[PDB]
Amino acid sequence: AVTNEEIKTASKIVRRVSNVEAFDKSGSVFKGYQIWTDISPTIENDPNIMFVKCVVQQGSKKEKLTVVQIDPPGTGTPYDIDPTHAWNCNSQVDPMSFGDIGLLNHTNIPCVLDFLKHRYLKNQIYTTAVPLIVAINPYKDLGNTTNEWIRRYRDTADHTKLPPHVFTCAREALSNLHGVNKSQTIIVSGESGAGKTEATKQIMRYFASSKSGNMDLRIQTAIMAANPVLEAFGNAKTIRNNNSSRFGRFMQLVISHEGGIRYGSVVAFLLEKSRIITQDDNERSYHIFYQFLKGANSTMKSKFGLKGVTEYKLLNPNSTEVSGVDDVKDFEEVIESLKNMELSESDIEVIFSIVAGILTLGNVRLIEKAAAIMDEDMGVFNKACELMYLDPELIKREILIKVTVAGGTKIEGRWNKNDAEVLKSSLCKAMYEKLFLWIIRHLNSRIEPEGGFKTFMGMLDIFGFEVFKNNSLEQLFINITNEMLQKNFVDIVFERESKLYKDEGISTAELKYTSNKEVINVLCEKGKSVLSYLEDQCLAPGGTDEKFVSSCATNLKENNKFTPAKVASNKNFIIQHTIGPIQYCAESFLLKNKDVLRGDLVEVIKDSPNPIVQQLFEGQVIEKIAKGSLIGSQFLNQLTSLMNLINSTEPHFIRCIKPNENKKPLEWCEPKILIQLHALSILEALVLRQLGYSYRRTFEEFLYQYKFVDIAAAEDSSVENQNKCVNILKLSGLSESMYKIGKSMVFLKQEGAKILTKIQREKLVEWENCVSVIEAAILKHKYKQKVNKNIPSLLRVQAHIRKKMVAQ
Amino acid sequence: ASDMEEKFREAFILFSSCSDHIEMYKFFELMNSFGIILTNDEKAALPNDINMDYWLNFAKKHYNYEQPFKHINNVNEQNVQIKIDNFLGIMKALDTRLTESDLNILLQITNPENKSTLNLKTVSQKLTESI
Amino acid sequence: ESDVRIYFNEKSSGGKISIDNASYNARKLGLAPSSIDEKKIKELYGDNLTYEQYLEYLSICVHDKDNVEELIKMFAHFDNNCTGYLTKSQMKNILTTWGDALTDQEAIDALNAFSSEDNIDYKLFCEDILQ
Ligand SMILES: Nc1ncnc2c1ncn2[C@@H]1O[C@H](COP(=O)(O)OP(=O)(O)O)[C@@H](O)[C@H]1O
Ligand SMILES: [Mg+2]
């Protein structure tokens, strides 16, 4: 499962920032001094392990350390590591005692990974790196998202006494909305299988839980019913996920302060059309196909003339079954959900007639006569069109008759087998995508507010940055979205910090901002971008994929953000994305961008006697291709609208992690988790929060915490709290650069706060023995209490051992 | 006669996660749980891979049977009372592993009342009872 | 049902069975009694049971609630890295320190009978003894 490309990437993410203090004043190793190292036979032999715990041996030199691995258990063998391969350890720390990664003394990569690991192993899958919430997929039901948990997270007096959870984010977002009359957006991001759709569904169920009723239950049920429907039509079983979302989703919700969804709006964008036609081995198409064919009753099967799951060219005959997926039971849920979306039994029959029609059309065989439909399949063709409420003669004419414009005259001709197969495929894909969008459009007409949203709760459930072996146009669109989301993240972190300093009268010139404006421009900017050049090449008469790549290298020399490829320089390009360089393959890019149904076929569909079929392409406009018709052109339009809307809201960020590629609980692959920590800006979030005046506590908070730095200045009745703090700070030994006194708070640099903790500790040296003995005596009591809870279980083991003894 | 062996054995395995060997940092916690305090020079002279038997001998030689928790309070001196928030301040300043729960438990035990100060003779008495 | 009377008659003295012989009969009968079940029937009828009290005792010794999930709790508690394994020494220390503690020979034997290796899959050990 672990690639060498993952090992190369993971090792590039590791950095040694914190220098290890293994020696005393005398130059002697601190007895038992623990470090993290990336040098071990355990690491060579186990691709899952990236770091091991070692103790620095008595006799080490500062230039080269002699260490012995202790965790995982080793040989007891001393070996030598260079200090650039030793990292600080958070020894004697409970990972369950606090929720933020940043409250750790050491936040180096082996330290972050260990904290997350030990929490994950105790079924604490949520951890913050403010403002981000990290959610690691447990690949099992932990039972932490039940109604008892919703009521607990919702009705608890002091919100800060609850551990991190997706419900904490749902609660904070809903409090701010109603508290300061401001719209919010919960952004759920991660890779396929990370747990995004689950986190989304969990948050919606939290929102749908009202303390004392919802009179708008009819709207809430329609919205909640969208989950099974959107999944059936837009999710598929891939190799990396049995229920993969193959679209981007955005929702706006109107939720009462007590819980209860009153209004909503759903948006589904970038649906993977190619899946409708072909699927890789061990991969299915959209669940709906299998749910429908397997679950449809005898009457429905005879009406639509349905054949089996293994009997359709559009469906892989070998990946029909999925482990723990009952398509029949899921179909019953889908029918009920469609009914709850206020669709009539007539509407539902049209929905499945079109699905049956798309499937039937895929079975029609074409031959070379110029192309022609096989006579054997002429009835199969007619049934397909009747099922899709389309004109059989007019649909036939659009698949087999070609209208070329030579000179300035229209010339009737014929499509060859290959060209006609493309048109038939395009019709299948277009009919499906527009039906999927119509179901959403219909839902929105039942759930949306008549005059638009005043204040809403936004929700984005989107694929994070994608870095595959072959990165195509879909990866380019995903990575462009994620660049806009990264700008949103760095912008809000800055805006929030800049306001705090300003409110307290601290200098905002010291603050740091890393813009991705350069890479946004190279990808989107009108006239000088990859997307602008993709459009020009698509609109050009002799436009090719190679001329697109060539025009990119020729006109994007001002920034390093565009870099031409080394191996096959043409047909390949590389972009300097925020998470590093991503290499795209421009092969089929123009074909992919132009993959939108042509003018004349659309007009036949609009001319259907069925009102639902007439609505699929409502006001599409007739047409070679125009700018606004290309996938990328429409994509950038939607993206700007979507981003303008989110930039108007207070953002919330849920970053999901897939801990292994095996879909197993309690299985931790460090190289894979590290690539994700990086890609999800979890590591950058720690960096950002640590910069500048990192520590901020009220005068009273500072005085309780740093009391014994100078107990005389702290316990002086005459001086004010603002003055006491300047007296403690001036006497301490801290440089003026390390601290600032604000209106209500003491502002400290991260380094200054650590020195001040160390000053206070020197002043209380006489307590060290007393505090050690009290703490250790309590820990011994605490450890025995954890044994006591498990003694009833042990009595059972012992009882069975003594029974097995008698048996002998 | 008052053998502490069975208690020294159980305490080692609570700190070693039932293995017959213990890490250096966890040996320090174990000895300290019995009031044993070592100097940095005594710490350095310890074996690098401490086993059960080494501890059982070390504890017999170092444990103060007459006065465990002499490092919280010595009966030979007198000067034994601190304000609750000052004690909690010191506990936190020296970076305790002890959580808010653990500390609150320790507080209602060693201070059954809500008296403005905590007595260290009462802390050492209560901790000795709990051995 | 037949074996229940057959085993009782083998250990029965003056129409009554002792608690140690009643527990031995339950072990012979494939039941796994503990000190808790032994203390329950002690609280009710003393150390010598009639045939009615002996049957009622075998009813307490039916622990249908027993499975791998339940029994593994103490071992799982000491498996900090969640490997699903513990060494023989870890498990011997658990089995001989707390609860109805076994002797060091009894524990060593039970473990040595299960595996020849130092690292024991404790889920498989518990599954084996339940049989
Ligand atoms: N919080 C969770 N608890 C339990 N299982 C989960 C959780 N999140 C995800 N899963 C499991 O992982 C699978 C993939 O998660 P999913 O929400 O679809 O991720 P994504 O949308 O990022 O691809 C789920 O279908 C489910 O089996
Ligand atoms: Mg999803």
Author numbering:
A (entry chain A): 2 to 370, 378 to 631, 634 to 818
B (entry chain E): 2 to 79, 82 to 134
C (entry chain B): 28 to 158
What does the paper say about this structure?
PfMyoA is a short myosin with a conserved globular motor domain and a lever arm that binds two light chains: an essential light chain (PfELC) and myosin tail interacting protein (MTIP). PfMyoA is a critical molecule in the parasite life-cycle because it powers the fast motility (~2 µm.s−1) required during motile sporozoite stages, and is essential for providing the force (up to 40 pN) needed for non-motile merozoites to invade erythrocytes. Here, we present the X-ray structures of full-length (FL) PfMyoA complexed to PfELC and MTIP in two states of the motor cycle.
The converter orientation is the same in both the motor domain (PfMyoA•MD-PR) and the FL (PfMyoA•FL-PR) post-rigor structures. Major differences are located at the ELC/converter interface when the PR and the PPS are compared, predominantly due to a sharp kink in the pliant region observed in the PR structures that promotes contacts between the ELC and the motor domain. SAXS experiments demonstrate that this ‘folded-back’ position of the lever arm is not primarily populated in solution and is selected by crystal contacts. In solution, the lever arm adopts an extended conformation as seen in other myosins. In PfMyoA, W777 is sandwiched between the α5*, α5’* and α6 helices, thus interacting with the hydrophobic core of the PfELC C-lobe. These interactions between W777 and the α5* and α5’* helices are not present in the folded-back PR structure that displays a much larger kink at the pliant region and thus moves W777 away. For all three structures, the electron density was well-defined for the motor domain and the lever arm, in particular for the interfaces between the HC and the PfELC and the interface between the two light chains.
